[PDB]
């Protein structure tokens, strides 16, 4: 809830689970997929898209029920004179399954001339480079997208965060809900201390 009304993110969208409903819901484990892309590639990061980025770099599952955090930036990932430190795969012999990383380096094969350690004709270098420059337009600006994944398994979830607390009032016949027990009675001071774990 404190990360939505901060007014510091350019794109704060979710899928399936509403942003105002995941605050009081348990989660088994939350991932953290952080990557820097361009401006036109933000629309391709969605469950059910295709192209040359979602099918060759980061693939999203069909049943993705998480959120997509993305903000504008031009100083934390783009220096003066052009930043060519972020590479990406353009073509490959096969696609990538959802939630799978690839750090290998191979030459793409187009038609004949099988490509295996030799470049030139019919063999091109797939690892290109983004043109993150502060003198370009708006669509060429870098966006540090952080995708969070939500999964539920049979293991007991350790991340829930249920509700906030209130004030305390005694000498009144009001309603109180301490822990999971709901009781309606008058709270009075007692001198019989119980065990320090009950």
């Amino acid at each position: 809830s404190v990360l939505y009304n901060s007014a510091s993110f350019s794109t704060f969208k979710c899928y399936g689970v509403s942003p105002t409903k995941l605050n009081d819901l348990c989660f088994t484990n939350v991932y953290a997929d952080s990557f820097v892309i361009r401006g036109d590639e933000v629309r391709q990061i969605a469950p059910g898209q295709t192209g040359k980025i979602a099918d060759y770099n980061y693939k999203l599952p069909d049943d993705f029920t998480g959120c997509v955090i993305a903000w504008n930036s031009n100083n934390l990932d783009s220096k003066v004179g052009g930043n060519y430190n972020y590479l990406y795969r353009l073509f490959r012999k096969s696609n990538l399954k959802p939630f799978e990383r690839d750090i290998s380096t191979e030459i793409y094969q187009a038609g004949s001339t099988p490509c295996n350690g030799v470049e030139g004709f019919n063999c091109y270098f797939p690892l290109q480079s983004y043109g993150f420059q502060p003198t370009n337009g708006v669509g060429y600006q870098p966006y540090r997208v952080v995708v969070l994944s939500f999964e539920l398994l049979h293991a007991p979830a350790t991340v829930c965060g249920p509700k906030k607390s209130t004030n305390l009032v005694k000498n009144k016949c009001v309603n109180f809900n301490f822990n999971g027990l709901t009781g309606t009675g008058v709270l009075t001071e007692s001198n019989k201390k119980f065990l320090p774990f009950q």
């Binding site: 337009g137 708006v138 669509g139």
Partner: protein
């Protein structure tokens, strides 16, 4: 695997590295324009050297891929601009000899030998605002006997070298290569070969010929009061009485001819001072013209990367109306913006070139730019023409909304534009057809000056004041010929200027002439124009023309609707002045 599949991989690899090299050559050119230093000249040459070396290296490996095996009708248009050879297709010894001729014609044209003063704007203002017969005649004869005499051995070798270079790329002559840009080489169904360009152009000149007769007879009849002995009512106008060395720009003759003295030409300079403009303020007012019509807005980095004010004389910087395109979403403009009407009309003329590249920004670099030359200039002329209409300026920032003109004011407005737009129309058709006979072989090598004056009286209507021999040379001193540029790009600019204006004003519920149409407050004219401006090199110009106008070739009919009040007024004023001219009278 598939031949068409692997061909796209070779083009994606080229575009991922050509945009980085092309941006370096454009960025180095902006550094020299901002600060005049000798270090920026070497950086521009080193950036352009790697661009010419990488383009020539990728063009050799691209010849192995078959071109006739393209069925998508899209990859073939991307291989034509990559597999080009240019003037380097011949021998290595002949490459430096052909390039040297281009430098000899530009060095003599840049230097001045008349005494000292240059040609433009030096000698250009002498043979126009002097009002004399023996003063402006001596300056025109001295230029042909010094500049034209040093171009005879250089122009003869320019024909033999361009003929062999054109036949190396499976063509005919030099004039046939320029006609190949208009040939449809992508989507079929719209057949338009290079031989079709010979027609159409000759057909539109016959219908526009009566319009040119009323304009040439009006200027000839005005100078009869100043030259009653030489200029005859049944004669013509010599070459030295045109306000230009070749008779191309006739705007200089407007100061001598005055159609009506009650209403002067319109001027919006007084409206700029009342609203307190700071020169940059013009760029803010020009942005609303493209937003209210339907075109997309500008970028965020355009107001901080492009020059908007004047640096002054204390800073070494240059400026000239130009369309710079750095690429990759970066767009800059270098124009010394002042506070007058001249800089306001040229602002919208060059801003259209920036909006053109933004249409196909997401498209690859090979699909950028038009398929034919001269099409980009037509996009800028339709924007500057609407910037001078009084009915259009009353709905924006400058001027008062309660401003209108009468019939006496439209005469001065249509006459001024007739000496620039349609004034150079017969001059372009004359040189375009005359060069097709010299390069082929229909004109002997010793009859270049004799046939030159014969085509003037039959197309432009200019007699020969000084009979030239076999030693003079007129076309070699042209700015386009000396720089290896095609002159046909200005012919299509005049025709397409009124065809695009008629289509945008038709959907806005407006018919008739085009001197009072409205462009703003109409989202339909901007959506139709944006259709073909996104296509670029992906589709030919014949199919893209039907998306706006609705034809496949040029048409002179929309041009006659704009000059309708002018054609009627010139008919009654020239009917006592031998409408037209006769080729029997001679000045000598």
């Amino acid at each position: 695997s598939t031949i068409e599949e692997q061909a796209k991989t070779f083009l994606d690899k080229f575009n991922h590295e050509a945009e980085d090299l092309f941006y370096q050559s454009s960025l180095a050119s902006w550094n020299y324009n901002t600060n005049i230093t000798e270090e920026n000249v070497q950086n521009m040459n080193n950036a352009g050297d790697k661009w010419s070396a990488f383009l020539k290296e990728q063009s050799t490996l691209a010849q192995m891929y078959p071109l006739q095996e393209i069925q998508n009708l899209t990859v073939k248009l991307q291989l034509q601009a990559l597999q080009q050879n240019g003037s380097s297709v011949l021998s290595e010894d002949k490459s430096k000899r052909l390039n040297t001729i281009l430098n000899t014609m530009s060095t003599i044209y840049s230097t001045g030998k008349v005494c000292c003063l240059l040609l433009e704007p030096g000698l250009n203002e002498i043979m126009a605002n002097s009002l004399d017969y023996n003063e402006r005649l001596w300056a025109w004869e001295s230029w042909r006997s010094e500049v034209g005499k040093q171009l005879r051995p250089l122009y003869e070798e320019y024909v033999v070298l361009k003929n062999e270079m054109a036949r190396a790329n499976h063509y005919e002559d030099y004039g046939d290569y320029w006609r190949g840009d208009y040939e449809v080489n992508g989507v079929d169904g719209y057949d338009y070969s290079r031989g079709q360009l010979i027609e159409d152009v000759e057909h539109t000149f016959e219908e526009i010929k009566p319009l040119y007769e009323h304009l040439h007879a009006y200027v000839r009849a005005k100078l009869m009061n100043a030259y009653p002995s030489y200029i005859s009512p049944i004669g013509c106008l010599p070459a030295h009485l045109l306000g230009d060395m070749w008779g191309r720009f006739w705007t200089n003759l407007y100061s001598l001819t005055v159609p009506f003295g009650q209403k002067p030409n319109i001027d919006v300079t007084d409206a700029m001072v009342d609203q307190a403009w700071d020169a940059q303020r013009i760029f803010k007012e020009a942005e609303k013209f493209f937003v209210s019509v339907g075109l997309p807005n500008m970028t965020q980095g355009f107001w901080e990367n492009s020059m908007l004010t004047d640096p002054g004389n204390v800073q070494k910087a240059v400026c000239h109306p130009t369309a710079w395109d750095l690429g990759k979403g970066d767009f800059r403009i270098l124009m010394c913006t002042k506070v007058t009407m001249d800089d306001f009309l040229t602002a919208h003329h060059e801003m259209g070139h920036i909006q053109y590249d933004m249409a196909y920004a997401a498209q690859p670099f090979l699909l950028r730019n038009g398929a034919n030359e001269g099409f980009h200039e037509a996009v800028g002329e339709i924007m500057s023409l609407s910037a001078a209409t009084p009915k259009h300026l009353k709905s924006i920032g400058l001027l008062s909304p309660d401003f209108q003109e009468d019939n006496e004011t439209e005469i001065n407005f249509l006459l001024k534009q007739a000496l620039t737009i349609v004034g150079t129309l017969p001059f372009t058709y004359m040189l375009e057809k005359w060069r097709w006979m010299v390069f082929k072989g229909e004109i002997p090598k010793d009859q270049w000056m004799k046939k030159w004056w014969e085509m003037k009286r039959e197309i432009v209507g200019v007699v020969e004041p000084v009979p030239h021999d076999e030693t003079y040379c007129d076309p070699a001193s042209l700015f386009h010929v000396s720089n290896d540029y095609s002159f046909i790009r200005y012919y299509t600019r005049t025709l397409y200027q009124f065809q695009f204006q008629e289509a945008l004003c038709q959907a806005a519920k407006h018919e008739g002439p085009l001197h009072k149409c409205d462009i703003s407050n109409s989202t339909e004219a901007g959506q139709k124009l944006f259709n073909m401006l996104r296509l670029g090199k992906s589709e030919p110009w014949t199919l893209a023309l039907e998306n706006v106008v609705g034809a496949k070739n040029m048409n002179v009919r929309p041009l006659l609707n704009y000059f309708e009040p002018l054609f009627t007024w010139l008919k009654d004023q020239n009917k006592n002045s031998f409408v037209g001219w006769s080729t029997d009278w001679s000045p000598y």
